[PDB]
Amino acid sequence: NTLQKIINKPLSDFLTSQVRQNYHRDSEAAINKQITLELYASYVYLSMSYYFDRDDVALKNFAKYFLHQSHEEREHAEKLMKLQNQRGGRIFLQDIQKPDCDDWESGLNAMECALHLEKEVNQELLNLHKLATDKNDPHLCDFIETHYLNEQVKAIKELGDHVTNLRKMGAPESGLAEYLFDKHTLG
Amino acid sequence: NTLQKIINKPLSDFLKGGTSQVRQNYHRDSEAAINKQITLELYASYVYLSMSYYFDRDDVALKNFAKYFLHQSHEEREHAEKLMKLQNQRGGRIFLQDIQKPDCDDWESGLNAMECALHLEKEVNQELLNLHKLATDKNDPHLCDFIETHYLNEQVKAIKELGDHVTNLRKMGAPESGLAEYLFDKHTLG
Amino acid sequence: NTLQKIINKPLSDFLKTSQVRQNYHRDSEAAINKQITLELYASYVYLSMSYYFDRDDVALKNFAKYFLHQSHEEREHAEKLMKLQNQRGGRIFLQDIQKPDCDDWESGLNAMECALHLEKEVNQELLNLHKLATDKNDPHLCDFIETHYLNEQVKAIKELGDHVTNLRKMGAPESGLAEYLFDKHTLG
Amino acid sequence: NTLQKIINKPLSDFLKGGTSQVRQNYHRDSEAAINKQITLELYASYVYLSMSYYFDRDDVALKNFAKYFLHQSHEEREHAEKLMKLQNQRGGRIFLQDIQKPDCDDWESGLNAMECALHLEKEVNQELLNLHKLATDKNDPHLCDFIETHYLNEQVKAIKELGDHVTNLRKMGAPESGLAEYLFDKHTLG
Amino acid sequence: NTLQKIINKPLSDFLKTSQVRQNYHRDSEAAINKQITLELYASYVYLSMSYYFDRDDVALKNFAKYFLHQSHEEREHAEKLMKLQNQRGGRIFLQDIQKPDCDDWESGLNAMECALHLEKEVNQELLNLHKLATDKNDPHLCDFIETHYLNEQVKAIKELGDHVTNLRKMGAPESGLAEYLFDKHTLG
Amino acid sequence: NTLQKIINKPLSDFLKTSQVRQNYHRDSEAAINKQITLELYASYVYLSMSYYFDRDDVALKNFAKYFLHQSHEEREHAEKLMKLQNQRGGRIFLQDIQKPDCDDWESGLNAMECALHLEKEVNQELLNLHKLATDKNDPHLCDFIETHYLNEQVKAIKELGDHVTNLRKMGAPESGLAEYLFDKHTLG
């Protein structure tokens, strides 16, 4: 899992200003690591979106839904870069690795992969909050809380709801199920 | 059922002790039965509240089933508040009691929840009819007309709608077809 | 005190795996179920308080309106905790809602004083809930309590203290004129 | 600096003596530190007020520098009023003290004033972070969240903006170029 | 009395050539700096007064609003004197703003009485400032004090005297009902 | 130049029949996937430029806005190319987006010059892509390039050249006043 590979790199791989105060180098590095995760997640959703744009898949609202998710992730990354400059840290950009799948199989499978991805990103934001708590950085703790933590919980709950419905309607075997879910839930 | 335990409790247990300047032709039994009816409406409110957030679960995820029962829970609380208003209007004294928890935490499906709601509404309707019989026997025409205009047709309408909902879900294959409950959630409750 | 009895009940009485569950301890899950019954109980107290002032021998309509509003706010508090429980993957476990401690709230001052004490007892449980979430390293739960309960609780306590003060300075418990004018000028 | 004398004064000197019906989980140290923070915000208000009318002088005459610092002076007074509101909300007692005069009557230029404002905001931010550490140690989550939502990001935003202002003025030749301060006054602060 | 101490400070403590300066004596310049600290001090007293009535054990919201407004008016008075100082070519010389004399203002009546006395003490200094400007043959300074301070001071004194009278006739210091009704009907 | 390494990569590395595919050569499908990578890379470069000027030691807000908008336009270009790939029956093959060459652009002039070079390099690959479509007799792909990229590329290059000229005339990278005034008057 290339996502798990990014999560396992040390903080030193993601590395004085007049504005800097109470901003630990570990926090600065973790913010740069979080930028990479958000940019990667944006790439995964962009890939998912145009998979459903294929003539042999052709689920238009699945495509719209994941495209909007991709733009939300890109917006998260840009707000993290803004925070980095606000605190006096320096942005250190890395390669955005390609997603692990070219073919996402089905609408149910794509929602299951999105649920897994959001829970893995949530764990990193939780570890990022723990690091900011250990470094006594309450401004960074507040930033993570206000902008991410409840947004991840809602995204995870919404993806779980979508997974549950698709499985109860007929799993990926019923192409009728994915079509009707595309119209009635994502429409 | 916890409902039956409330229904079969002696009337005098719904009185504060076990005269208002406004009290007139308001029998102690009627005052007691109004307090009993408040407990039933509050209980029914709790049942629909439990039902509502069952469908809000990530492993059930029927948003309109959840919205529908939450609205019903609020209507029941409103019926109870109006009965408390009536109790004070006639000079009775409100005597509250524990609101017992519902019998289930896990309703099985949209069909089963509709069916349990149908049974609950008929049980509450029966107690409302007994309350009317008591008001007739005590020659309380104001109480009789109060029950008629505010509860009797509303219970009949609720009972008819729940039956329609049960019927439609059964015809689409509700217990087994998750597609049936999904499309009913969209087309009828949405 | 029924409320003290609920507060002293152990966490295990508020219990008995989800695809959305993450970093959600069983203790936090039980404590959310505990807080749900506290808010439901508080809603019941205010409901009782409200219709006491609707009595023909009390007849303070704005006291009644004030407490009925607080009753609906506590119910909304409870419903948002049930929504949170499902958001995090816990299982809602409902208990009996005990009847309020009083049937007769005596006066407007006395009802305000009981409301102040009730809101302070609920605040303590919220602070204990926040402490448990901090120990369990649940920042989302910590933030949820912070944004939705702590400042609202502090504002509720300050408003009730203000009300109790004005009523006492007006001569409330003896002076029925004081409670009438307070009902008109502050709650009206 | 007069600021450092306030910061290093013992906590108990910011208490009235040296229980409210609403007081709950509000430690004496927190009550003292809120009174200390009020003195700092009032001091910062005085500093920006002195800065503002320096640029209003006929021999300085930078109208937008004057408007900018006067607005900052009003924001600081507003922070102090809100802390007095919080003190009463939690049952503490407001204890005021002398607002010491600023250290300068003659700020040297627009750049120097921006730089002194940058230093003052970082000094106040540091005391706000110490106040948060104290509220954490006393397990006061309401106070922690109050400081977070109302001061911490606002201080970071103020600190970033002042740094931008200092940077731009230095790049245009601010200390020596009066043209630089004139055009910055027009294009950035106007 | 901190205010008496400021008033008794000599003019030389409020000092230490401009192209705009004309007919502006160093005495007038020092007296403007003195008046600035008086208005700043008065703003501090009213601020203290305001949040005394915001206390949960006082809880008179319109008293608090009234005094907070007066605090901002005194601050605006001070800022206009700083603008005048620069208009005439003087140099602003800021001093410490002393803390108010009281922490506890006792009651609404007592706060109004202290406000009346404060406004009368500031009025005296304004009249002394106008007298100095007349002796120095500074008609612009005389006119500035006339249009911006004298009638506003007289109106402030008359309004506070009215307030003190109504509170006393209502039974203010003993009767908490009086101060509550005055807060609602006159300040509300 | 990381850009050149992408440009010099063979077409076979950009490849991993549909009912809609018609007259769509495998080389064109691969070259579309290559152009997607180029537009995504350019988006990354402009995003890096944008937040360079957002730094507190650079602090040119309109430079930052100008490049952020350019970064969104490049990403919009990439999304329309993926739409084209699916329209013609090709299969999107995504690759790593390489990090930009510089973390630290030196100034507004240097960033503008680097943008000028980048757009010219992307224009050359679009012209090669048009040449490939011409040789494979793909008039639909030729027209797609003509209408959506060629004139937009020419307009971007002329604008960037205009900006570079003005910045150099005004005082080059040495005048910080020049970059500030250009930021206000041209990019504002």
Curated annotation (Swiss-Prot), chains B, D:
Reported function: Stores iron in a soluble, non-toxic, readily available form. Important for iron homeostasis. Has ferroxidase activity. Iron is taken up in the ferrous form and deposited as ferric hydroxides after oxidation. Also plays a role in delivery of iron to cells. Mediates iron uptake in capsule cells of the developing kidney. Delivery to lysosomes is mediated by the cargo receptor NCOA4 for autophagic degradation and release of iron.
Positions annotated to bind Fe cation 2: E76, E121, Q155
UniProt subcellular location: Cytoplasm; Lysosome; Cytoplasmic vesicle, Autophagosome
Catalysis performed (reactions): 4 Fe(2+) + O2 + 4 H(+) = 4 Fe(3+) + 2 H2O
Subunit structure: Oligomer of 24 subunits. There are two types of subunits: L (light) chain and H (heavy) chain. The major chain can be light or heavy, depending on the species and tissue type. In the human liver, the heavy chain is predominant. The functional molecule forms a roughly spherical shell with a diameter of 12 nm and contains a central cavity into which the insoluble mineral iron core is deposited. Interacts with NCOA4; NCOA4 promotes targeting of the iron-binding ferritin complex to autolysosomes following starvation or iron depletion.
Taxonomic source organism: Homo sapiens
Site (Essential for association with cargo receptor NCOA4): K36
Major subcellular site: cytoplasm
Entry's EC annotation: 1.16.3.1
Short name of any one Pfam family annotated for the protein: Ferritin
SUPFAM superfamilies: Ferritin-like (SSF47240)
Gene Ontology cellular-component terms listed: autolysosome; autophagosome; cytoplasm; cytosol; extracellular exosome; extracellular region; ferritin complex; ficolin-1-rich granule lumen
Pathological association: Hemochromatosis 5: A disorder of iron metabolism characterized by iron overload. Excess iron is deposited in a variety of organs leading to their failure, and resulting in serious illnesses including cirrhosis, hepatomas, diabetes, cardiomyopathy, arthritis, and hypogonadotropic hypogonadism. Severe effects of the disease usually do not appear until after decades of progressive iron loading. Neurodegeneration with brain iron accumulation 9: An autosomal dominant neurodegenerative disorder associated with iron accumulation, primarily in the basal ganglia. It is characterized by global developmental delay apparent from infancy, and progressive decline of motor and cognitive skills. Clinical features include delayed walking or inability to walk, spasticity with hyperreflexia, ataxia, dystonia, and poor or absent language.
Keyword Lyase on entry: no
Name of the featured protein: Ferritin heavy chain
From Swiss-Prot, chains C, E, F:
EC code(s) of this entry: 1.16.3.1
Major enzyme class: oxidoreductase
Catalytic activity: 4 Fe(2+) + O2 + 4 H(+) = 4 Fe(3+) + 2 H2O
Binding site for Fe cation 2: E74, E119, Q153
Annotated phenotype, changing E119A: No effect on iron binding but the oxidation rate is severely reduced
Disulphide bridges, residue numbers: none
InterPro entries in alphabetical order: Ferritin, Ferritin-like, Ferritin-like_diiron, Ferritin-like_SF, Ferritin_CS, Ferritin_DPS_dom
Subcellular localization: Cytoplasm; Lysosome; Cytoplasmic vesicle, Autophagosome
Residues under site feature: Essential for association with cargo receptor NCOA4: K34
Record keyword NADP present: no
Effect of E39A: Reduces iron binding and oxidation rate
Binding site for Fe cation 1: E39, E74, H77
Keywords: Acetylation, Cytoplasm, Cytoplasmic vesicle, Iron, Iron storage, Lysosome, Metal-binding, Neurodegeneration, Oxidoreductase, Phosphoprotein
Source taxon at top rank: Eukaryota
GO-annotated biological processes: immune response; intracellular iron ion homeostasis; iron ion transport; negative regulation of cell population proliferation; negative regulation of ferroptosis; negative regulation of fibroblast proliferation
Example GO molecular function: ferroxidase activity
GO cellular component: autolysosome; autophagosome; cytoplasm; cytosol; extracellular exosome; extracellular region; ferritin complex; ficolin-1-rich granule lumen
Tissues in which the UniProt entry reports expression: Expressed in the liver.
Keyword Nuclease appears in the UniProt entry: no
Subunit details: Oligomer of 24 subunits. There are two types of subunits: L (light) chain and H (heavy) chain. The major chain can be light or heavy, depending on the species and tissue type. In the human liver, the heavy chain is predominant. The functional molecule forms a roughly spherical shell with a diameter of 12 nm and contains a central cavity into which the insoluble mineral iron core is deposited. Interacts with NCOA4; NCOA4 promotes targeting of the iron-binding ferritin complex to autolysosomes following starvation or iron depletion.
Pathology linked to this chain's protein: Hemochromatosis 5: A disorder of iron metabolism characterized by iron overload. Excess iron is deposited in a variety of organs leading to their failure, and resulting in serious illnesses including cirrhosis, hepatomas, diabetes, cardiomyopathy, arthritis, and hypogonadotropic hypogonadism. Severe effects of the disease usually do not appear until after decades of progressive iron loading. Neurodegeneration with brain iron accumulation 9: An autosomal dominant neurodegenerative disorder associated with iron accumulation, primarily in the basal ganglia. It is characterized by global developmental delay apparent from infancy, and progressive decline of motor and cognitive skills. Clinical features include delayed walking or inability to walk, spasticity with hyperreflexia, ataxia, dystonia, and poor or absent language.
Descriptive protein name: Ferritin heavy chain
Source species taxonomy: Eukaryota, Metazoa, Chordata, Craniata, Vertebrata
Chain's gene name: FTH1
